[PDB]
Design an enzyme around this catalytic site. Structure first.
Site, PDB file in Angstrom:
ATOM      1  N   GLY A  68       0.890  -1.094   0.000  1.00 35.95           N
ATOM      2  CA  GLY A  68       0.000   0.000   0.000  1.00 35.95           C
ATOM      3  C   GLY A  68       0.923   1.135   0.000  1.00 35.95           C
ATOM      4  N   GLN A  69       2.126   0.955  -0.569  1.00 33.30           N
ATOM      5  CA  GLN A  69       3.132   1.955  -0.643  1.00 33.30           C
ATOM      6  C   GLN A  69       2.703   2.785  -1.752  1.00 33.30           C
ATOM      7  N   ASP A  70       3.403   3.872  -1.910  1.00 32.43           N
ATOM      8  CA  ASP A  70       2.826   5.015  -2.506  1.00 32.43           C
ATOM      9  C   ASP A  70       2.131   4.927  -3.830  1.00 32.43           C
TER      10      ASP A  70
END
Lengths: 290, 159, 177
Positions: B53-55
């Protein structure tokens, strides 16, 4: 309102890979024109990180390679990082051919966000006992050196030490080719070393040095003896390739009346031996120059 | 079914996954991307995207905006950090409609790993308390623990 | 590199298949080449022509030409071997000869260029063996059985969990003088 893009989609299901193959070919042909309109990307995307079909992957991959990739999507389609992680794994793959093949591809490949930890990845792969894999890195690196040399910066030496570790002629040959392009100096140092040993060895690698030496003198000399010592040994000369070059290099180097003679002989015999006429003419042409 | 593991993966969100898959653990760099497995049950083979759920990866998942069928939320139960914030994001899933085609599981992972909240405490906190047009029984795991999971799931495919 | 492209040719004014080692331009380099090749320049015979320092290297093999191109010097024989060698390889690679078969085994054929020749370097011998390297492997399998299995065990188990829960010198002196 509907389209045959979809027609292809069902086929793929229908067969699996098989149908898809067909699709690749079509796609290819479609691709070949330029031509396509997107959407199958999604399909591809969907099935492919969870799918094998190696050959297909190879087709796919290549397709990616030949086709653009800095695609109007980006740059990347934008997944150029995520999918790669499987691929990276494959690239990691213990599975050596598989890596090698990738590598082959990879030499063709040049997609940076993906590259960076693959730089790490590659480094590991070099260690793998397969000369195929390792060799493949030599191309790949070559590919870097122009594209983002820097990406790796410590390389020319690293290679050079590597050479030390190394002993597969095939890889060596390669090693030279790249090494001089990075820097001659290392090759030279080694050259000093090798001077006696050469004679023992296989040609192909030997050849590559002959080019290098040439450029530098016109710019500047003072270097001779060390070379000479060898060079005389080279005045054995015996492969048709070797000989072909050997007299050719000589003239490049020299033109003393004695020199004139040496080369000349080589030709004359050569010719005499010679059979392919096309060849014969060529030397003349040189001669014609001469 | 498309089952979704989101949050930033590399934390062992991915561990959580690797543990399922091989039994193993994160022996990857912390992993932003799609991780895929098919797990077969009811022989719906659940295709798991363990995605950070990284950028960007959070940011960009539109091709994966399609229609869901299963929810894992893999949890740092030491995170009790991005969850309110998460709640704030989470609404837009809620505001998605594809997103209402899954009877789910939030999985509380990383319990041993520091601690965890009231099963309830969390429940409001991600905004979870509030659903119903999707089922919503709750299941804790850890990432060095988790069982009965499958009860949660059992109901879930059989919704 | 010692060849920016290998293109396998049929008589048609057109080269039956090709591959571009390096892209930049457009076919017009390749396209132009194709045109010239088709034209043959009416020229009678001769399996080689180099003109304007560009080797156009070919071999008629039948109604087919296999073609390589280069511009600066080379050692011939090696080369020949290759043209010829191509002429050994194909009925194996793509099956016999007629464009189509090749049309189906395009991928195979291109793969063969790369495989055979890594940038103008004669890579090996043994065609079958050549098959071997990829899409024909060994390692991967070895790994897979064990691994897949191991996982599988974990999975199986899981199913339950789930389920329930002197000479030199002569010269040298002379020269030296």
């Amino acid at each position: 309102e509907p389209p045959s893009e979809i027609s292809l989609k069902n086929d793929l299901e229908k067969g699996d890979v098989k149908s898809k193959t067909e699709a690749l070919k079509k796609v290819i042909i479609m691709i070949l024109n330029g031509e396509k309109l997107p959407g199958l990307l999604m399909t591809i995307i969907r099935f492919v990180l969870p799918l094998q079909d190696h050959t297909i992957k190879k087709l796919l991959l290549v397709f990616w390679e030949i086709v653009p990739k800095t695609t109007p999507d980006g740059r990347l389609l934008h997944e150029m990082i995520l999918v790669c992680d499987a691929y990276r794994k494959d690239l990691q793959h213990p599975n050596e051919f598989i890596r090698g093949s990738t590598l082959r591809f990879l030499c063709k490949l040049k997609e940076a966000e993906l590259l960076e930890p693959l730089m790490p990845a590659i480094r590991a792969c070099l260690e793998h006992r397969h000369s195929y894999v390792r060799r493949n890195a030599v191309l790949a690196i070559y590919t870097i050196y122009r594209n983002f040399e820097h990406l790796i910066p410590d390389a020319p030496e690293l290679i050079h030490d590597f050479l030390v570790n190394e002993k597969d002629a095939s890889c060596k040959r390669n090693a030279f080719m790249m090494l001089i392009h990075a820097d001659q100096d290392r090759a030279l140092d080694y050259l000093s070393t090798c001077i006696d040993q050469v004679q023992t060895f296989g040609d192909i690698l030997q050849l590559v040095i002959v080019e290098l030496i040439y450029k530098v003198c016109h710019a500047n000399p003072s270097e001779r003896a060390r070379f000479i010592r060898c060079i005389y040994n080279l005045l054995q000369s015996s492969s048709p390739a070797v000989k072909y070059e050997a007299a050719g290099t000589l003239v490049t180097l020299s033109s003393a009346p004695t020199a004139i003679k040496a080369a000349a002989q080589c030709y004359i015999d050569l010719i005499i031996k010679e059979s392919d006429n096309n060849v014969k003419l060529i030397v003349l042409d040189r001669l014609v120059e001469l | 079914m498309r089952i979704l593991m989101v949050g930033l993966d590399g934390a062992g969100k991915t561990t959580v996954l690797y543990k399922l898959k091989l039994g193993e653990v994160i022996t990857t760099i912390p992993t932003i991307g799609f991780n895929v497995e098919t797990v077969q049950y009811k022989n719906i083979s659940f295709t798991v995207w363990d995605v950070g759920g990284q950028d960007r990866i959070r940011s960009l998942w539109r091709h994966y905006y399609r229609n869901t069928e299963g929810v894992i939320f893999v949890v740092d139960s030491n995170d009790r950090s991005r969850i309110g914030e998460a709640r704030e994001v989470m609404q837009r899933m809620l505001n998605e409609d594809e997103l209402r085609n899954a009877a789910w599981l939030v999985f509380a992972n990383k319990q041993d790993l520091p601690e965890a909240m009231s099963a309830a405490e969390i429940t409001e906190k991600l905004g979870l308390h509030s659903i119903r047009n999707r089922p919503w029984f709750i299941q804790a795991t850890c990432a060095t623990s988790g069982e009965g999971l499958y009860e949660g799931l059992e109901w879930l495919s059989n919704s | 590199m010692v060849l920016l492209a290998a293109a396998v040719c049929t008589k048609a004014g057109k080269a039956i298949v090709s591959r571009q080692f390096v892209e930049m331009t457009r076919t017009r380099i390749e396209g132009l080449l194709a045109a010239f090749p088709k034209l043959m320049n009416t020229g009678k015979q001769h399996t080689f022509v180099e003109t304007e320092s560009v080797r156009y290297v070919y071999q008629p093999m039948e109604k087919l030409y296999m073609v390589l191109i280069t511009t600066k010097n080379s050692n011939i024989l090696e080369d020949l071997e290759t043209l010829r060698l191509f002429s050994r390889v194909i009925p194996e690679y793509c099956r016999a000869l007629e464009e189509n078969e090749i049309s189906e085994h395009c991928f195979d054929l291109i793969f063969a260029f790369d495989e055979i020749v890594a940038l103008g370097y004669r890579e090996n011998v043994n065609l079958a063996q050549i098959r071997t390297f990829t899409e024909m492997d060994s390692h991967e399998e070895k790994v897979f059985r064990a691994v897949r299995e191991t996982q599988e065990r974990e999975a199986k188990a899981e199913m339950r969990r789930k389920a329930k829960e002197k000479e030199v010198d002569n010269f040298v002196d002379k020269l030296k003088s």
